[PDB]
Amino acid sequence: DKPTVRQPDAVARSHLSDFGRYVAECLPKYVQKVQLTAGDELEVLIAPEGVVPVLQFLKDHHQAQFTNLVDIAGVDVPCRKNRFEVVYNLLSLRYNSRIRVKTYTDELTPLDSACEVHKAANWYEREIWDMYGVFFANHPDLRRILTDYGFEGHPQRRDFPLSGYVELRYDDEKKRVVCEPLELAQEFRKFDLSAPWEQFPNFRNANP
Amino acid sequence: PEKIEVFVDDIPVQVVPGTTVLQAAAQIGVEIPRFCYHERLAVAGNCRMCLVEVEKSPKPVAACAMPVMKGWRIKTNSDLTRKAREGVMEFLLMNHPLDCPICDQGGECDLQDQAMAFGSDRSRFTDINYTGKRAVEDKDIGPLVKTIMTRCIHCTRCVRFASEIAGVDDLGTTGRGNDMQIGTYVEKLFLTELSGNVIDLCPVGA
Amino acid sequence: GKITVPTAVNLSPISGVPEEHIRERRVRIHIPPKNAMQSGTDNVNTWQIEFDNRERWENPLMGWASSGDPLSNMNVQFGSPEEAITFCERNGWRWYVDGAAKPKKERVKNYGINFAWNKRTRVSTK
Amino acid sequence: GGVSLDMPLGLMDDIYEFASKFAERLDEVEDVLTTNRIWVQRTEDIGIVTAEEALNYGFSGVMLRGSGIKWDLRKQQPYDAYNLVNFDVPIGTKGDCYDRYLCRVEEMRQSLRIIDQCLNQMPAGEIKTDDAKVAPPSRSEMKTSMEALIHHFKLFTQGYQVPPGATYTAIEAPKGEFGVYLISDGSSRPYRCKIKAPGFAHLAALEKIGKQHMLADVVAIIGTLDVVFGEIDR
Amino acid sequence: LRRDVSPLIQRIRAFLLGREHNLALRFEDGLADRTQPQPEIPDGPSHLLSANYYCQRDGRREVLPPIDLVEQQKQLAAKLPTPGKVYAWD
Amino acid sequence: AVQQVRPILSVDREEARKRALNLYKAWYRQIPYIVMDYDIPMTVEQCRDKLREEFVKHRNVTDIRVIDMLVIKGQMELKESVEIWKQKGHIMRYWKESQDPKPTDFLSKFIQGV
Amino acid sequence: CRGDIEKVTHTGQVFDKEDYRNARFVNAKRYVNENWGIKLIEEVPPKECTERVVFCDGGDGPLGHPKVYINLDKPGNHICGYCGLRFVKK
Amino acid sequence: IIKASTGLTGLAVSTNPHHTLSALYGKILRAVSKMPQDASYRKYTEQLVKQRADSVAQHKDITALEKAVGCGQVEELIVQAENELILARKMLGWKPWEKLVQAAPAKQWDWPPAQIM
Ligand code: SF4
Ligand code: SF4
Ligand code: FES
Ligand SMILES: [Zn+2]
Numbered sequence A: 001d002k003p004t005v006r007q008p009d010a011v012a013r014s015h016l017s018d019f020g021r022y023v024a025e026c027l028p029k030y031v032q033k034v035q036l037t038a039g040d041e042l043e044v045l046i047a048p049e050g051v052v053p054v055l056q057f058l059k060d061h062h063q064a065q066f067t068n069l070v071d072i073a074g075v076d077v078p079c080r081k082n083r084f085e086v087v088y089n090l091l092s093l094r095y096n097s098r099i100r101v102k103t104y105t106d107e108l109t110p111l112d113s114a115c116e117v118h119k120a121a122n123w124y125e126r127e128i129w130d131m132y133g134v135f136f137a138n139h140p141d142l143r144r145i146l147t148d149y150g151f152e153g154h155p156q157r158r159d160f161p162l163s164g165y166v167e168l169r170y171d172d173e174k175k176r177v178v179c180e181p182l183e184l185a186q187e188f189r190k191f192d193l194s195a196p197w198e199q200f201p202n203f204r205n206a207n208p
Numbered sequence B: 001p002e003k004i005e006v007f008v009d010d011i012p013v014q015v016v017p018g019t020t021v022l023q024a025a026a027q028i029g030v031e032i033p034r035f036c037y038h039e040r041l042a043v044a045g046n047c048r049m050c051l052v053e054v055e056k057s058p059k060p061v062a063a064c065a066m067p068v069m070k071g072w073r074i075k076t077n078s079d080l081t082r083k084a085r086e087g088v089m090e091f092l093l094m095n096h097p098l099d100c101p102i103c104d105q106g107g108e109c110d111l112q113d114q115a116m117a118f119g120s121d122r123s124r125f126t127d128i129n130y131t132g133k134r135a136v137e138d139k140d141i142g143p144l145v146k147t148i149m150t151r152c153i154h155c156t157r158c159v160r161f162a163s164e165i166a167g168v169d170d171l172g173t174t175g176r177g178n179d180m181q182i183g184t185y186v187e188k189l190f191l192t193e194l195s196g197n198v199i200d201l202c203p204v205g206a
Numbered sequence C: 001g002k003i004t005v006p007t008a009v010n011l012s013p014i015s016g017v018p019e020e021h022i023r024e025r026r027v028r029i030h031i032p033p034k035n036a037m038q039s040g041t042d043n044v045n046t047w048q049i050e051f052d053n054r055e056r057w058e059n060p061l062m063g064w065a066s067s068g069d070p071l072s073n074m075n076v077q078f079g080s081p082e083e084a085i086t087f088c089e090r091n092g093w094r095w096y097v098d099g100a101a102k103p104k105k106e107r108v109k110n111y112g113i114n115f116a117w118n119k120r121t122r123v124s125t126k
Numbered sequence D: 001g002g003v004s005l006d007m008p009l010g011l012m013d014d015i016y017e018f019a020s021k022f023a024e025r026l027d028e029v030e031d032v033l034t035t036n037r038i039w040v041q042r043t044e045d046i047g048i049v050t051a052e053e054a055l056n057y058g059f060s061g062v063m064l065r066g067s068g069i070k071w072d073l074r075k076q077q078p079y080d081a082y083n084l085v086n087f088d089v090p091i092g093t094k095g096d097c098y099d100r101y102l103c104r105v106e107e108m109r110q111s112l113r114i115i116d117q118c119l120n121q122m123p124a125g126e127i128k129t130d131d132a133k134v135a136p137p138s139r140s141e142m143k144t145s146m147e148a149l150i151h152h153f154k155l156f157t158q159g160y161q162v163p164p165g166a167t168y169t170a171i172e173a174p175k176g177e178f179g180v181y182l183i184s185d186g187s188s189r190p191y192r193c194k195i196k197a198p199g200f201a202h203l204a205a206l207e208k209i210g211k212q213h214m215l216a217d218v219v220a221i222i223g224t225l226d227v228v229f230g231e232i233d234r
Numbered sequence E: 001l002r003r004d005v006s007p008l009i010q011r012i013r014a015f016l017l018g019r020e021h022n023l024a025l026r027f028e029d030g031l032a033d034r035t036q037p038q039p040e041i042p043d044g045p046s047h048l049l050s051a052n053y054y055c056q057r058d059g060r061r062e063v064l065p066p067i068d069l070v071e072q073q074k075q076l077a078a079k080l081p082t083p084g085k086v087y088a089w090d
Numbered sequence F: 001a002v003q004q005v006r007p008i009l010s011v012d013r014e015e016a017r018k019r020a021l022n023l024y025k026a027w028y029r030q031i032p033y034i035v036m037d038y039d040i041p042m043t044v045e046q047c048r049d050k051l052r053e054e055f056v057k058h059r060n061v062t063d064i065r066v067i068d069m070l071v072i073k074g075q076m077e078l079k080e081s082v083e084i085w086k087q088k089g090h091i092m093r094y095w096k097e098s099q100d101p102k103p104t105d106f107l108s109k110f111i112q113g114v
Numbered sequence G: 001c002r003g004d005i006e007k008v009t010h011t012g013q014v015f016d017k018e019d020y021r022n023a024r025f026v027n028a029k030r031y032v033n034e035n036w037g038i039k040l041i042e043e044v045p046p047k048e049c050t051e052r053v054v055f056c057d058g059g060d061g062p063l064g065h066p067k068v069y070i071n072l073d074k075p076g077n078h079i080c081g082y083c084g085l086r087f088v089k090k
Numbered sequence H: 001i002i003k004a005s006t007g008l009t010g011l012a013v014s015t016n017p018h019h020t021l022s023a024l025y026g027k028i029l030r031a032v033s034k035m036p037q038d039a040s041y042r043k044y045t046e047q048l049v050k051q052r053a054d055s056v057a058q059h060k061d062i063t064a065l066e067k068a069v070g071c072g073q074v075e076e077l078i079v080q081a082e083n084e085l086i087l088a089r090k091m092l093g094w095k096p097w098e099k100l101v102q103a104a105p106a107k108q109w110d111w112p113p114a115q116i117m
Helices: A011-026 A048-060 A121-131 B021-026 B079-092 B110-117 B157-166 B196-201 C081-090 D012-030 D037-043 D051-056 D062-066 D097-120 D139-144 D146-155 D198-203 D215-225 D229-233 E007-017 E069-076 F013-037 F044-057 F064-082 F106-112 G020-025 G037-042 H017-032 H040-058 H062-069 H074-094
Strands: A031-037 A041-046 A068-076 A084-092 A097-105 A166-171 A176-181 B004-008 B011-015 B051-054 B073-075 C003-006 C026-030 C047-051 C056-058 C065-067 C076-078 C094-097 D165-172 D177-184 D190-196 F002-005 G047-049 G053-056 G068-071 G086-089
Touching (some): A011 A031, A011 A048, A011 H040, A041 A048, A041 D165, A048 A097, B079 B110, C026 C081, D012 D097, D037 D097, H017 H040, H017 H074
Parallel strands (some): C026 C094, G047 G086
Antiparallel strands (some): A084 A097, A166 A176, B004 B011, C056 C065, G053 G068
């Protein structure tokens, strides 16, 4: 027996596999790929034109009441052609389950706002807009929610620096908090924590 | 020079004859951990980290000195290969000094990275409270080389680089058994214009 | 509802990069060097872009190193050089490639050449 | 992989005395806060959240259970011996500030019996997982053996190699549902760690709840929303 | 002994509280000892000397890439489906 | 060299230029309220000159999605300027105050080390 | 005059009189440790041993440095690289 | 015998839940009758709505109907039926039973991004 290895839940595997084949059968227009990851989590990989009609479907069907939307997450992967991906995590209280709906979006290409489906997307879709520049069309008001009012740029992209571009200091000549180009007293020491030997042989050919 | 068919990790590859199992597996991407094989040095078997399991064979084969033939199925990620690598590597780690916090190759040591990647997670050496470990005297090499032979794993990369590429014969291995020492028998300066590369070629940091 | 656009865009106005960093910074696209004291190569296969080194000075108070360059610590990973070229032209950076990868080094490793007759490849040690 | 250090000796001998003394202080708080008519006038029929409001607007935790939804993440999706303990879940009816306040004090009451069960059954064993490549070894093994010193060196210079993949875990915070969407690229650093704070989704409905209420009503609404802005601002 | 009032003020406080009062502050005799003997931490499942191989208990290397559920049916085929059990939250 | 994308806030460059003119018209109407409601040293004519300078800085762009992105961010900054959420220090960030003007000649950059 | 400014440390550092950085010590004391490690490790005598290889722990077991083994076949004083204690074989 | 309260804030106890459920299931059937028969959503929706209409036709009691269906209370059944009717009237506009409008681009959905080839 192996007590240091997490045992997967089979009743969260079979139900999620049957539901993944079910949602692939019910929506062949938008759903490209459904996958059951390690850790018993189901991912649906939709087209960017199907953000609203998939998240509406999982909201209102009898066999899928994913009525709760917990978080909308943006991941910036600059290697890909469409660099941003947007992940909608949905919780189903009736069937006691979770789903993740992932789509790909570029900064210039807009995305459908899920605010008509779930009202939590009134704010979460602002936050990605504050941090990646993913424009969400047909939004109630798409404003800047977390960064400063005079901030220029989206900070959580991987092409943005860690320490930012500018700093703030009080100027007693102008009697106000002015903006200066960045000069750190001690620079950020970039540690080269790269593994020269591969440790996972199961992920060697997982890219095709 | 017709290529031959080798199934490595249940993956086909066409390799020219005479190539090693390590080269035939590095053609597709998988790499076998190594200590006594450099690409620019002679092949040897002073470590046994290259023991991979080929099918229908009683013993594991040394992948950096195995001329592969037609239709071998090499299993790098088998259970026997991982057990052999863990056993050989804890044998390598039995007498090695606990000098990692005072060793300049710590963080770029091949022994540390292969202990995380392929070695075991704990020690089965219960003989450190009594009869101890192996310790050998430091050899006298000049102002370019700092020498602590307690960290050495006896792979003869330095001896092969001296004998073949550097051209000086002053380096060698003396003695038998656990007492083999990889150093000069007398106090001599290992003088060579290419001596610094030996610091690159020592895999552990002796 | 689709329009027609060129596939080459310039996203330097809509980004947060000032003019003093977009007009005079050179981006090196390179494969990072393998550590010569290690025999592994899993950190080599990924291409990356980096920026040119700028002035780093001693602090007047303590002995720390201070730099006004915000982009000295930003290396961005890519799977191919051409995607890095597309990224550098899309973000308006002035790019250059340090060097392409080595295509193939054909080498043969024979154990029998260590012990050979009338050949100079015979070893003297073991 | 577990916890960093073991419990000191005699910690539970103070936790038991403290949990025995806590209930009288709870009753002394309800003697001045519960059923005082001014507290009822500031907490009843104020910020009424319906069931479809809490379901559609992403509410979690007490804001779900003030309105009558029986969703507690410690029982529906159990984690870390919450299925080996037995407790009741406080469910409100009206959905106002008074029902949420009573739900929070009842959560403080049921946490005492979960604490009682945890001190009653506690196994004698290790504190960390024994995979030494994901957890640091003991200092005696680090100063004695070789593999533990190598793993101590590695895991305290460059982090343990997590396999590449995405997961979203979510547990029952006292505020609500606290979620981590952690995505790893196979290196020693995470590629992405998005945090679902429940206070963000609770605060996103303040624009609709706070309309046609008074100023002290809104002060009581942020008082009962149970928001902490460190996780909201992330 | 404990630092406390005389029993008249005690009965006045217990009458005004409405319950039998217990002391809200810790004392030295009602707490654990600060100095204490050294413990021993028991060993776990993998501290046995024999029959412990890492590859039999390897947690990180048993993780697979995610399974394509559309292609899984296609390569395995060569009461409506629900994502979980029904929970009644009413 | 031609791809089909989803338009953001425009379908042609004349429409995008028209909406940029709407943005400039609303900014020009909001200048004297910005000078009145903020405690800033800059006057109305200096604010209008700064508005013209920031428009002719972005004169060079050509792409429809890029110019619509610029119009969207300009309308967001304007909405942060009508409703007073920006401060007096955020308004005076357009004029590069408390910044020494860096020289352009090679000799002064050679003496100063830049 | 103040003698705490020109006093050297164990790292061989002192601000000379023409330096501008001694103006920070006109109102504050310059902190120089008077317990140098070099003299305090030269003060202890070397340990004489008869066996060929010895082990240095540096003190108590869990409270000392990690255990090393020193070979004393070479004549002279062999210094532990962790603690600095010197061993010698007769 | 009607219940005093449904236990949820904002939900009123339905006076005639059986007629409302039957009318909503009939409206869902009349909505999905316009869809093509090769679509999977129409077949699955017709199957579930037919079995729930059989459930509301066999059981004339409220509590027996909530026990037989097993998905919450009957007011939640009315809410789910209205939600499915909204979904079906959106499916007649969106038409999702066709092919993919955008295939996945190259190297898009593989996670480890910078691996060569
Ligand atoms: S040679 Fe390597 S394993 Fe040995 S002490 Fe040095 S860093 Fe540690
Ligand atoms: S000194 Fe280094 S290179 Fe030479 S045999 Fe020992 S480990 Fe190998
Ligand atoms: S490197 Fe191949 S056996 Fe030693
Ligand atoms: Zn020592």
